[PDB]
Amino acid sequence: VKKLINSQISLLIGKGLHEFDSLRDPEVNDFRTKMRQFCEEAAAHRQQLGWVEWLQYSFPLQLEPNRALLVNVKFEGSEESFTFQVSTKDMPLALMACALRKKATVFRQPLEQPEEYALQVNGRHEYLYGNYPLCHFQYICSCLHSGLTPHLTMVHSSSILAMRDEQSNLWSLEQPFSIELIEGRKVNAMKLVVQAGLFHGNEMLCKTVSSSEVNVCSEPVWKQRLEFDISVCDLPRMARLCFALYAVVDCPIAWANLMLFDYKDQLKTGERCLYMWPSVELLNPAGTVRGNPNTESAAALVIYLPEVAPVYFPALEKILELEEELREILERSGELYEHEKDLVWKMRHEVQEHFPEALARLLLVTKWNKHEDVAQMLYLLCSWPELPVLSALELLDFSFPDCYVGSFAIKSLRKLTDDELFQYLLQLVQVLKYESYLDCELTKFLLGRALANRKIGHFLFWHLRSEMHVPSVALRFGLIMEAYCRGSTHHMKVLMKQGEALSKLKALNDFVKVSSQKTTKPQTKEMMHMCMRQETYMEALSHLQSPLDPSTLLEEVCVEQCTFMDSKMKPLWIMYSSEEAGSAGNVGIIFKNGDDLRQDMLTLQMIQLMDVLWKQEGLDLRMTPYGCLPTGDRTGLIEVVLHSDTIANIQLNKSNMAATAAFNKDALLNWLKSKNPGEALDRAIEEFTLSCAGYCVATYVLGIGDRHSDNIMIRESGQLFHIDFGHFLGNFKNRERVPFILTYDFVHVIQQGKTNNSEKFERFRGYCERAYTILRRHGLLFLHLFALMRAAGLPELSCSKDIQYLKDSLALGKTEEEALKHFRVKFNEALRESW
Ligand SMILES: CN1CCN(c2nc3ccccc3cc2Cn2nc(-c3ccc4nc(N)sc4c3)c3c(N)ncnc32)CC1
Missing domain, CATH: 1.25.40.70 (Phosphatidylinositol 3-kinase, accessory domain (PIK))
Structure with a gap:
């Protein structure tokens, strides 16, 4: 076992x-x-937590950063349910009480306090409890904005406790610091040098030292002594020794670093063999201080750490x-x-x-x-x-x-x-x-x-x-x-179930990649469906928590709705439904295999942040921070946003659609009028207007470039969002300084399809200004977060030049005042740029 x-x-x-x-x-x-x-x-x-505490461990509340509300409640064993009128200001307990009083009458009353229960979102790993207004709860909100009626289930405390149960498992040494550099084992064209240096962080603790010029063989021999311009009794507990190996007439060949004190703080001695890393200012103090595990192919450097007595850092x-x-x-x-x-x-x-x-x-x-x-x-x-x-x-x-x-x-x-x-x-x-x-x-x-x-x-x-x-x-x-x-133990089991789905998803994608190069999409799609219909697939791909968000459950996979895009890395569109969750269970994932989703994930997270700060201050710009999670080697998932499309797509302005425009500029607005008839339209334009303002500002500050109509989307609700973020910090594909952007197709929609609407436009202008100024108040927060990420080795986030982009786009150099004027400068430019 x-x-x-x-x-x-x-x-x-x-x-x-x-x-x-x-x-x-x-x-x-x-x-x-x-x-x-x-x-x-x-x-x-x-x-051994209390049941509520367990809930907080296992299904943490999802909260928001008046008016009447319809709610449907049901109890754990029955399909019988009740539909209350409630207030968005009411606490969950109130609702539970009502559900109890309704239970007690139909089923003639004993009857058991509200404080025994928690409300579970039908067919999700979400619950609602705690002293909160009902509309502080994300799920409750979702429904409000999007019409829907909340479906919850009264879960008795002892039921939860059954869950909890089923988841049980010295300054004395003044001499200078020396090493010996003996020899190596490796490949190049010339002469070989090694240079060494001592770092504490990005800081050198003294002048680096070099090796003498040796011939370009494969098994070099120096047997050199190398003494540094620091006393030994001075080395700080975190002293880092760094080497770079190269050829000369410069050719970098490899690098290698180690801590001079072992992990129990012992000064190290004497012989080390150093299995080096391939080579991409030659010195790399940041790089790992463990050696290359490819010990059959890594160049090796043997060195010697002199003895000086044992000695433990104080x-x-x-x-x-x-x-x-x-x-x-x-x-x-x-x-x-x-x-x-x-x-x-x-x-x-x-x-x-x-x-x-x-x-x-x-x-x-x-x-x-x-x-x-x-x-x-x-x-x-x-x-x-x-x-x-x-x-x-x-x-x-x-x-x-x-x-x-x-x-x-x-x-x-x-x-x-x-x-x-x-x-x-x-x-x-x-x-x-x-x-x-x-x-x-x-x-x-x-x-x-x-x-x-x-x-x-x-x-x-x-x-x-x-x-x-x-x-x-x-x-x-x-x-x-x-x-x-x-x-x-239990989580490990839940996560394996996720790795399995991923695994099959990879198999399915490879077959799609093959089949597509020997047939038509329709033919390939029917094959895909068949391979999915095999038991081992049906079973692996069904009933799991979504790795993009564990509170979403992917129950039954709808094979008839799955497909792939026929271009490039052949991504997969996999759809789910769930009888329990009703509409809420109709979710999808997109499986991409062959791209690097890491930088997308970073961008969407800065956008999520941006939203939170804006929201914290009462501005909801109706953003779409959708899930995106790398899970393996150039492999990960992207959440499906239902009821959306690409701008480009809506602009194919295809005959026999509702959106049939006589002039291409009407296309976008036609589409919203078709998705939002009569009175509903005013709402959608507003949504469009707020989301547009957010993305204007977020893409500008982040230097998101390469923005076509095929990587911008709208939701039937009106909300516009950006997807596919592969170049940021001005680094469009070398490094430019993207202007503020403003498409004329959008200015059309904001102005309700009119040539002048300074009224509607100057609002929009304000939005932007506002979103912009709030971000600046948290300039450092971005700075510090982007600074920590230089670690990811993201190629568009390597260095000083990269993070510079942000200081500037945020003009954290200027004042509250001059930043905003300077802003307006690049806004009117972008404006007069709209043809
Ligand atoms: C047909 N309609 C709805 C389905 N549609 C798509 N079908 C796909 C089928 C297989 C693989 C990808 C597809 C992408 C789309 C359009 N699309 N693209 C995306 C999308 C979103 C983010 C994203 N990030 C990348 N690095 S690639 C990428 C693609 C998308 C989404 N997130 N949610 C909903 N629809 C989305 C095009 C417009």
Whole structure:
């Protein structure tokens, strides 16, 4: 039975656990046991929560960032149901009470308090409970805007408890620092050099040193000594040694990095063999500090770590043993001349006292290649007041490589609400890539939070699982997933069911790719349907939680509605229905295989954020942040938005449609008039107008380029949205400066199909201005989030030039005033550009 579990984990994570063992490694071996402990105790806590608490773990509320309402309620065993009039201001308890009083009369009354129940959304993994107005609940909202009547089910507490039950599991060393560079094993055309250097973060702890010029063979021999311009007793606990190997007459060949203190803080010695990574300013301090696992093909560099006695980096305990100014004027870019830094350092007790939020600026002027300077910084750190989340996020960057610091950030991040934490999860994962060691505060934090909230849990898994084909993080992520599963047996089973669907989806897609190159779509579609109709398909692809959103259930797959697009990577359109969920169960997914959805996922998340900030301030721009999740190697899912189309498509202005325009510009409006007759039209134009304003501003600020009519969509409701985001930050395909954009087809619709409507247009103008100004108030939030993502190795997000795009598009350089004028400048341009 333990064997079975183990083998299912292996299948889930996509890498056998025997591959962990066979490395014979203390770091790994300790990670696995210590974490297993951690996670299982979390299982223990969970399996004894109160029923409500369980609900919060297992189906977290989905909330919003008056008038009368129709609701249909039913109880768990019967199909008999009741349809109340309720108030959107009513608490769920009120509704439950009504449902009880209705139960008690039909079924003549005993009768059992409302506080025993929770309302489940029919045919979804969603519930409604807690002291909230009914329309604070996302699902309730959905229905309101879209006409529909809420279908809920009274679930008694003991039913929930049955659920909970079924899911049970030294400064003494002054000499300079030297290594020996012996030899290697590898390929090129000339002469070979290695250069070395010591980094603490992006910072060099002294001048790098080079190798002497050796002939271009395959098994080079230096046997060199290499002494660095720092004392040994100075090295900071996080000192990072970096090499680059290249040829010369420059040809980069490979790189390699390691920590100088092992993970139990022992200064390392003596011999290391270094299995290097292929080669893409040659030095790469950010890159993984574990070696290439391709040990039969990686160039290897043997080095030697001299002995100097054993020596353990000091305990904190020891570390801790060791004018009327203008400093404010300097305290507001953040790059600064030398005297300026010396000031900060001198003033550092004042910064802790009267500018606690300047921690970061101080960490950067602090002298990490001087142990003394480090101990006082730390001294100060140990009594430093906690920081707001936004400063914490700043601290997570590569620039702050020290563990004590790392830990203080987590210490500030702990007050994250589950909803905020979810908003940043993508970033906190990509950051694991910077970790020096396996066992770390962050991982523990992520594991702890995942284990306490099944949705964090769900998405952590997929973020991790989607990078398994990436050698440099295969080991770390595989280990984290493993831990996670030890903490959740039942979830592991739910997630396997998802991997299986994915798997078949991959098989089905490959067959589609083949069949299509030997026949007509119609023919291929009928084949697709047949292969789907096989039991093993029918069964694998049905009854699962959607990896795009676990609260959506994909019940029965409607084969007659499935298809593929005949072009490119042949994506799959797979549709579901569910008797239980009624209309709400009619959902679809799109399976893409051959593209990289990572950058789309990032963009749509910045758009989701943008919406939340706008909403937090009372502006709902009617955005469509649809689900998009990479799940494997150039593989992932995209949520289907029903009742929508592409602009381009509506503009094929095909005869014998409702939309038959005499002039092409009418096409778009014709279509809305057909989807929104008589009185309904006014609504749709308004929707169109708000969504258009959001996407105008989000695409501008993000530098989303390559925008055709075939990657912009409208919903029958009026809402316009952008899809397919493959180039951003001006990086259209090299790097331009996309203007604000404004299609004339849209200005037509905003103005209700009239040539002048300054009235309607100048509203629109305001929307834009507003959406724009709010974003700016959270400029840093974007800056810090985009900074953390430089870790993903997204090729359109590599460097300084990339994030620059944002500072500018947001003009965080200018003031509340001059930003807005400057904005209007590029708005009227875009305007007069509309022919
Ligand atoms: C026929 N109508 C409705 C179905 N339709 C589509 N059928 C497809 C069949 C197989 C594969 C993809 C299809 C895409 C569409 C149009 N379309 N494209 C998308 C879409 C959305 C996002 C997205 N991101 C990428 N990187 S590619 C991509 C494609 C889409 C969506 N999310 N929801 C609903 N319809 C969508 C075109 C217009």
